[PDB]
Amino acid sequence: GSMEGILDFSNDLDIALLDQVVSTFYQGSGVQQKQAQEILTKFQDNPDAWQKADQILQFSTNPQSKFIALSILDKLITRKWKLLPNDHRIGIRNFVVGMIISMCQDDEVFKTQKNLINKSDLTLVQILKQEWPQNWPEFIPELIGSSSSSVNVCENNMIVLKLLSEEVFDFSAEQMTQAKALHLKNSMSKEFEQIFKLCFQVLEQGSSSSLIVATLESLLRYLHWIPYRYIYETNILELLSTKFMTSPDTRAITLKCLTEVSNLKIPQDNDLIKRQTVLFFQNTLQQIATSVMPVTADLKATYANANGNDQSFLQDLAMFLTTYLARNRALLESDESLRELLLNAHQYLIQLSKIEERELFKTTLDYWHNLVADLFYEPLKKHIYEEICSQLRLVIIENMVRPEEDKESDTIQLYKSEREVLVYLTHLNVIDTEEIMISKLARQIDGSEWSWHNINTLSWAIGSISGTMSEDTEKRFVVTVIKDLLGLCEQKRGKDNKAVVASDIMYVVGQYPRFLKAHWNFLRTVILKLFEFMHETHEGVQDMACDTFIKIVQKCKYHFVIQQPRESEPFIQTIIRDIQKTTADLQPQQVHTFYKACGIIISEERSVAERNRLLSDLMQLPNMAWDTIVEQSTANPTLLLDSETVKIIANIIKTNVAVCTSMGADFYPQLGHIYYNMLQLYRAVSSMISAQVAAEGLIATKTPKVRGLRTIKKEILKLVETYISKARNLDDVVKVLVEPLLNAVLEDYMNNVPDARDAEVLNCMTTVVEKVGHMIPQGVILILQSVFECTLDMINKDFTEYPEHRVEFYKLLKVINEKSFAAFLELPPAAFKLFVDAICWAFKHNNRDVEVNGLQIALDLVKNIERMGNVPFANEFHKNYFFIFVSETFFVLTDSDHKSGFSKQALLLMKLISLVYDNKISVPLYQEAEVPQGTSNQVYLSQYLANMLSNAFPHLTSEQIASFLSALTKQCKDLVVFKGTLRDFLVQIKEVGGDPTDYLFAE
């Protein structure tokens, strides 16, 4: 196209052609825009574009074109500054300084091109980081001088200083070496006395509102780091908390400054400091009440209307009040003359807490937790806040959110925080809480506040405070609540209303197990009702009954396993007798929840014979269905293509998993009933999957038929995994379970095509190794032989295919490396080398699941080799793989695509380096040829790394590399400092000419 002409630097740059490209990009659309976009990026990435920037800035009339010219300059200043001839450095400085002066002097330009001026100021600040103060000692005095000659230049100097403070104190940890950050911090500290002078004069003497705002913006930055004396030994707090709170232009920034002041480092001895801290709070609250809104104002309504900047102001006010009062409210609690201020501040917070804004509510709720926790533990404090706490009780009760039981993890977190505060508030005044809740409930029977939302929020609140009342008070409170909830349906007809109320009733009952355990007759009536509900097909009822059933059982199980006074048998027997009836109308996953609940009860029976008898009775139905279809499936293997038979099988095994989940080690007798026929079924299903894949192709793995068959395999593996992870008799695991299992699963996995291998096999094997790996060394060897090479070949052509196999593969290798390292020693050398390859391959993943295990395997392997002492396998390991691990770890450390693993990469690297500098490696890491005899591995390591880094980072000086390695080596016992030195190196490789003395920062 025509636009691509600016990309030809052999001709003079046509400024008008540049502005056409720029306008097409910023103002056009579609292909025009997308094409100019690719041209511009191609333009600004030309490493000679910076030479054409003074042209743009002198002669262009398009401020975007200039902005782009400054970005091109910024890239040069940040990376290649020190490489330029010094003439260009002084030159670039001059026409940035001059371009800024000219833009400030033209009041038309100054008011209408704020983006370009802010970009130019930032560009200047990049020069300052390179040049100041060592090569620019008069920048600050001359900045103070020029400020007096023009409001515009003075305003812009506040912007420059704001940005400089940000770059030096707020964003330097990442982007500078430790030494260079300290140099700039100290340099700013040295000259701040006169920076402050200027800033204080501007504030006291009024002037342009735009100038005042810009000065307060910079002050906000200074407060992050300046000494407290500049804040308390001047008049500035008075100005902030009075003058600048009255004007809406300065109010937002001033409030943020005062929030930071409420965090300064401040001595707690000085009574005059204490009085100044009280005073600026008194002034601020006074200005709010007279200039913004009174304490009575309806902030919920104001926030919802969202006029102008009200919402941001109310957010900022919440942050100010919460920040200040968490640090300083004790300053207000003893002086009777400050009581009104303390309670007015909290009344504002009460009003802020009624706003409908989730994140703001979380901010105020955090503060309430801070308050009520202190009132709960600190003597003589709670009575001060009685009226505040009473209002807070209503606020929290009315804004309670859904607990887990009645998916959204933000809501689960918020409920827990609300519960904590309300529990504290109930301990502080249990009578007030009960009365608020009772009366809220009356107005649910009124109909005056009745609604699905309002009865749920109240039931959750009522449930949330379980444990705060005495048993006797709780007794009549619970009774009263259920009564009122039951009577509620006598007016709310319809099944939708009847469902809400039911769910709330069972939610409240489920939250008060102490009550249920003392009143058996009542607990039984509850359970029998839940069973009734399990035949109710209205949406959500059945799922409600089941979740309530297992929740009550977890808390009250002992009362189902004993025989109760006036009963003929333990109630668990009654449940089991009618289980077919009770569950006849549930879906399979609800049936499984039911069986799991029964297993919870059964495990409370500690007489072995009774527990096993209950267990055999519970499994009667699935065991009969199981026996039936093992007879049929074995006599006619085709039946397993009948989907209905496949689903019955899957549900039987899922039932065994559910019961095994709650019974764990006690499940063993039931496992023994099905074990050998279950693995036979595993073999049969496996053959059918293979036959289908042979007859239909890989697409077979997507059909419902095969997915049904693989569900059986996965559930069998999950059952075995569930039991073994909880077994207490590991001799039986080893002697009875492991051998039939490995014979059933390992060869099938190895000899299936990749798309038909189940990653769950790897997960199951991981659990086997975890629990009994130490007892089955030949079994571990067999696992590796069957899954290692064939799985590796699935996952070593890219980082995306077979994601689950990837994850489980490295979990398996990790556990084997922990529990049975001997198995890797038996690998033939070519296989041990693939193992090393597989570890490094894990390093290079961006997926945390793989990367973390990869770095941990590497670390554990080194420790395993080290333990072996001076023997030949350890010697050959270092000869073969020490420098592979060092260099592979360095690669991911320095390539900028594996930032998330920095800490574990650093740990691994420090361990590797420390081996050599403790002479823990007994043989030379070098060849006979390449180095004189006698050379220490220390000398050779530093030499290998110097050469490695020189070729990998050719723009580093030899001195940089040598200084970095000398420091890194000296620091290989101090991980914190070691890491700091690695960070410094990562900074320096991004630029040219880094200072090698930076690596002496630690000393």
């Binding site: 259920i482 009847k498 009143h519």
Partner: peptide, 14 residues
């Protein structure tokens, strides 16, 4: 009174 609650709960039905 807990006897009252039980009777009322037993009768609560769809």
């Amino acid at each position: 009174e807990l006897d009252e609650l039980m009777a009322s709960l037993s009768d609560f039905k769809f």
